[PDB]
């Protein structure tokens, strides 16, 4: 439930003490937990509502030059003067123009020439700022159990319901535990400061589209701008970048204007994210959040229930789910009330010895009418295994064949751990238990290497990284010194960033 | 007259036989001739009226996406189909999207997804073609002599007047000699094929501004386009470059459009020229024209005149003219009719021995009233020399001091010959006499080296040329082979192209 069609679901486990498994929650990737004797909830970061934004330097891109003039002098009368030189609503430039008897002068030489032009900008872009303290994360929980597949992405109504409940994570309150009343209460203390490296991420707004540009790229734009603390008729701080002065003679040179720089700043945004605007608050969908789940109050709901003793007809044809899990949905054709589904796996149905782990831990029926749908999730072993549901006579069976092997599972988990490391880096080691040598010391050495890497290379593209990886590959095969594996470390540390999408 | 305030005037001479001195006429640079006993005319290329242009691929830059749709299928039903896939007014893209029970499918896997979007372009650019055969050059002549400085750039009326007369050079008629009736007739056979390397120069029109792009740059643009043989609702041949498909799930992905590419194609035009549009004909101001002047019918007008025998009061304070020439303007306070001004130079006025050359050859007065202004042009020697005008008593004198030396004149003529060579190349040797070893053999070896250079490097900027000049400079000091002066030849052949503006 809610972690079923995401193609990026990670499974976490391993709480035999403490019950404080810690996770990072990206936007595209939901996370399913697994416990000893507690229900498996599915946590998923949905939005990130950046709220109450200020303004910084609002650039311009649509410049309209009008109301121009010119003035000159003979080659000894000094430079020219103009009334439209003495307001900063007009752009000006002085330029030496060759003059003589044909231009009514007295000598022959570099006569000066000033021209002016009123700068009228029509469509400007606005770069808002993002404080780190008014982020507003939105994590939606979803337990596994008594709910059919019609309530997987169904978000309409979760205050009345209990199986899914959402929580907000503000930096003024990372102490938010959701009340799954009957399941207990999932304690949840996130860490919204260390999000997507905020306070360097301006919120660029143009043409009613929105972005998350880096602060570096936003300050390094050569365009006309004014400070954001402004109102109508702004004062453009640097107009020389959008006007071009071709120098035609005879005491007036031509002031052409560069056109709409829309597409240029569009194709200059080769790495920024996209966001939407919900009015005053800019809701985006990206980033991550190193939370930490305290399962001190997750109890199984129907552990004091009997076993269902009726039909259990199948429905909705059970199917594999891209990691090997199997989402069986059954309907219970009886009236046993708040009862419990006797599901398991079996390599053979002569003995019925359960082998695969059941992801939907303690799967119950919460209804009491005739038909009551419910959705399981099972994880078969590699090979052939039957899906057994029902206690005795009128049990059901759907034979399964989970493809692959344990070596393939270990390789896929390795490559997705490398992908999660390539996306997050520092916060990749925050995915498990208390750590003594793999979640604290590893975070230390990876933090040191990530700082001394992202300050070393730090500014390379997708393609220049391939070029520098080929360069350190050639350096990593022709050297007779000890820095063969150091250049190969910078080979792997770059090309794994390239192997991901 | 008309070659007085151009700061690029070249002087040509040397007709002691043939009388067919040949010149190249750039737009910014006027050309003054000098003869044995013929009047010095001033020739100047004014416009270049490219007329009757066709159309080639007219690109688009303002794309407006509207009326979009989407369609999908379950992970085994093949790809999607749409009615808006079967017209080329809509852009489409198929993309695999992960689907499951939450999207109402039957399996879990790569379900396909097609989206469409109507391509509506608003502001398109049009690249016209330029045939080499409908160029229409416009050379304006101007003789030296009986005309004041009010008629230097005065172009209004030259059919009634004789001292200036214009000619057109079409490729259907490079046989155009102007009738300076009384001065004779300047024979003039130009060569309008070898202009600014035409038939590679498209005429890019956008936003009612105009350019002369290379054909290579115009065909190498990745933008939507259609062939120019068209009318309303065109068929855009390649729309994939201005739409971007971000893939959001749940059977509809978002079709964002890149904005106005105006500024991007503006800053991509880092080397094109600018032109104007005169309606149907595109008048530009650039390039050159290797003409050839036959002075077989240039006679002095007032060579059978007496000498003026009256006041010759100065007017308009005589001044130097950036090459050392001195443009004295006098008014004749008498009534001697069509008479002749007795002007000369003098290093001392005890002997009055003329030393400097008089540029305004045989300077006459054509009026007969009380006051009659006339403008001379004299070239003093290096040092101090007096300007003597008038025969006897009531002669006038303005002492002159021409600054510089003959070595400085030779160096300046060398650097402007190198600048003319750096601009033209092949046609730089077409600036003088018949040639046996300096205008034919030199054109041969320079033609060979210019072809084997402009096909060798041929595509480098202003800055990459500096980089490659530094590279061949370092190669030109550390080699023990014979290719030291060859790398230094490619040093000079590049850095002289960089020393010019």
């Amino acid at each position: 439930i809610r972690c079923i069609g995401v193609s990026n679901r990670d499974f976490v486990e391993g709480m035999s003490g403490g019950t404080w498994v810690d996770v990072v929650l990206e936007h595209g990737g939901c996370v399913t937990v697994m416990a000893q004797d507690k229900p498996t909830v599915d946590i998923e970061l949905v939005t990130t509502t950046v709220s109450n934004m200020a303004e910084v330097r609002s650039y311009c891109y649509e410049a309209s030059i009008s109301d121009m003039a010119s003035d000159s002098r003979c080659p000894t009368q000094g430079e020219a003067y103009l009334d439209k030189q003495s307001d900063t609503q007009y752009v000006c430039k002085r330029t030496l123009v060759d003059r003589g008897w044909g231009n009514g002068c007295g000598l022959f030489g570099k006569g000066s020439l000033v021209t002016c032009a009123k700068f009228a900008c029509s469509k400007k872009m606005t770069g808002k700022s993002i404080q780190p303290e008014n982020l507003e994360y939105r994590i939606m929980l979803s337990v596994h159990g008594s709910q059919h597949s019609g309530m997987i992405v169904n978000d309409t109504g979760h205050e009345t319901d209990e199986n899914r409940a959402k929580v907000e994570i503000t930096p003024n309150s990372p102490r938010a535990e959701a009340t799954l009343g009957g399941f207990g209460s999932l304690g949840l203390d996130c860490e919204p400061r260390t999000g997507l490296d905020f306070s360097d991420l301006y919120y660029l707004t143009m043409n009613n589209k929105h972005w998350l540009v880096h602060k570096e790229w936003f300050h390094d734009i050569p365009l006309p701008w004014h400070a954001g603390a402004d109102t109508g008729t702004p004062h453009w701080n640097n107009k020389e970048a959008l006007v071009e002065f071709k120098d035609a003679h005879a005491k007036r040179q031509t002031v052409v204007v560069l056109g709409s720089q829309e597409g240029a700043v569009h194709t200059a945004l080769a790495g920024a994210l996209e966001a939407e605007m919900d009015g005053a608050k800019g809701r985006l969908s990206s980033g991550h959040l190193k939370c930490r789940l305290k399962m001190d109050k997750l109890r199984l709901k129907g552990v004091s229930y009997s076993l269902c003793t009726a039909a259990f007809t199948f429905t909705k044809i059970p199917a594999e789910t891209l990691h090997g899990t199997v989402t069986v949905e059954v309907q219970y054709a009886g009236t046993d009330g708040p009862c419990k589904v006797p599901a398991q796996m079996a390599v053979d149905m002569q003995t019925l010895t359960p082998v695969g782990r059941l992801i939907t831990a303690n799967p119950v029926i919460t209804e009491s009418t005739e038909n009551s749908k419910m959705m399981l999730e099972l994880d078969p072993p590699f090979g052939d295994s039957y899906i057994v549901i029902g206690v005795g006579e009128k049990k059901i069976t759907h034979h399964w064949h989970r493809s692959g092997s344990t070596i393939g599972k270990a390789f896929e988990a390795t490559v997705r751990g490398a992908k999660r490391m390539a996306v997050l880096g520092d916060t990749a080691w925050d995915f498990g238990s208390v750590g003594g040598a793999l979640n604290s010391l590893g975070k230390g050495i990876h933090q040191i290497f990530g700082a001394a890497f992202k300050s070393l290379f730090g500014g390379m593209s997708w393609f220049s990284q391939i070029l520098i990886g080929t360069l350190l590959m050639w350096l990593g095969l022709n050297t007779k010194n000890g820095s063969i594996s150091l250049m190969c470390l910078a080979l792997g540390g770059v090309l794994i960033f390239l192997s991901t999408a | 007259i008309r070659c007085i305030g151009v700061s690029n005037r070249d002087f040509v001479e040397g007709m002691s036989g043939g009388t067919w001195v040949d010149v190249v006429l750039e737009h910014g640079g006027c050309v003054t001739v000098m003869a044995q006993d013929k009047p010095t005319v001033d020739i100047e290329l004014v416009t270049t009226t490219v007329s009757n242009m066709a159309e080639v691929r007219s690109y688009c830059y303002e794309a407006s996406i509207s009326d979009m749709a989407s369609d999908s299928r379950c992970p085994t039903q093949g790809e999607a189909y749409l009615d808006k896939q079967s017209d080329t007014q809509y852009v489409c893209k198929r993309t695999l999207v992960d689907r499951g029970w939450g999207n109402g499918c039957g399996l879990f896997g790569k379900g396909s997804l097609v989206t469409c979007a109507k391509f509506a372009c608003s502001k398109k650019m049009t690249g016209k073609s330029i045939q080499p055969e409908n160029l229409e050059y416009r050379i304006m002549l101007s003789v030296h002599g009986s005309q004041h400085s009010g008629m230097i750039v005065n172009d209004t009326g030259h059919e009634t007047d004789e001292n200036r007369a214009k000619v057109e050079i079409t490729p259907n008629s490079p046989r155009a000699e102007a009738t300076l009736g009384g001065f004779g007739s300047l024979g003039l056979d130009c060569e309008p094929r070898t202009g600014l390397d035409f038939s590679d120069l498209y005429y890019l029109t956008m936003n009612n501004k105009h350019w002369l792009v290379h054909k290579e740059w115009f065909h190498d643009i990745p933008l939507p386009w259609h062939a120019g043989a068209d009318t309303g609702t065109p068929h855009w041949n390649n729309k994939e470059a201005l739409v971007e498909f971000k893939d959001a799930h749940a059977k509809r992905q978002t079709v964002v459009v890149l904005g106005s590419q105006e500024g991007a194609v503006h800053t991509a035009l880092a080397g094109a020229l600018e032109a104007e549009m005169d309606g149907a004909k595109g008048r530009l101001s650039s390039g050159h024209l290797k003409c050839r002047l036959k002075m077989d019918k240039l006679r002095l007008k007032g060579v059978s005149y007496s000498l003026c025998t009256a006041a010759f009061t100065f007017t308009k304070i005589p001044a130097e003219t950036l090459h050392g020439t001195v443009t004295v303007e006098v008014q004749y306070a008498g009534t001697d009719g069509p008479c002749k001004v007795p002007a000369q130079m003098a290093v001392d006025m005890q002997t009055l021995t003329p030393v400097g050359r008089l540029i305004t050859a045989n300077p006459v007065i054509t009026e007969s009233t009380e006051n009659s202004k006339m403008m001379l042009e004299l070239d003093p020697p290096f040092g101090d020399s007096y300007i003597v005008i008038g025969v006897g008593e009531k002669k006038i004198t303005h002492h002159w001091h021409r600054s510089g030396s003959t070595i400085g004149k030779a160096f300046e003529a060398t650097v402007r010959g190198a600048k003319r060579m750096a601009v033209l190349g092949d046609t730089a040797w077409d600036f003088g006499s018949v040639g046996g070893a300096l205008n034919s053999l030199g054109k041969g070896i320079h033609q060979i080296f210019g072809a084997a250079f402009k096909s060798l490097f041929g595509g480098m900027s202003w800055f990459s040329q500096i980089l490659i000049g530094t590279l061949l400079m370092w190669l030109g000091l550390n080699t023990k082979n014979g290719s030291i002066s060859l790398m230094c030849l490619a040093l000079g052949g590049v850095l002289i192209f960089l020393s010019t503006a």
Partner: antibody
Amino acid sequence: EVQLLESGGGVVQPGGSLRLSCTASGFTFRNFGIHWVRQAPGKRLEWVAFIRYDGRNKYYADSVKGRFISSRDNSKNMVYLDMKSLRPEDTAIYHCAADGEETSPGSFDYWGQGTLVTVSS
Amino acid sequence: DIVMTQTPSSLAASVGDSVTITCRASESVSTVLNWYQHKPGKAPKLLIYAASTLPSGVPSRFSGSGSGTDFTLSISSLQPEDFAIYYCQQSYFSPRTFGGGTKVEIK
């Protein structure tokens, strides 16, 4: 919309003075610009004056330079045109035309009705 | 200082015609030029700014185009509220100078 009102015009003896009051309403007056244009009868439309939003930058035409003093009131929402020492060539309808700043670039935007200013013998 | 000459100022058309008045420039004004709809005893409103585009409020029958040397105002269907004084006006070269005024008369 744009209630651009005009006042102050009447009959004027030559060499006299005149203060043209233009009161604006219907927008934010501080962040726009304001012009002064005239309609000489028998001839075309002309332009005589221009003020920036700051209240100190004042531009005029060649005929009225050194003759017109044009100011504005941000607080009481007024535009003033202290014309002094007029001539009988200045008989027109001095419209109070609002500039198109940052919205309709390079254009006289919405006009005022203009008062009748006649100077004769 | 520049002048804005145009089409002969007298035209008499019926209601619902397609009139195209051209404005001829003196020099290269380059698509910064305006038009006005003026009635006697009435303040003029802006009709076409920047030689191509329109503000809000006015109907889209008014279509202006052209630059360089000649400009044009085109109305698709002459409503009876359009019989007014039309003149073009540049804003490239300063001082800003208007056209001549073209009367649209009833037929």
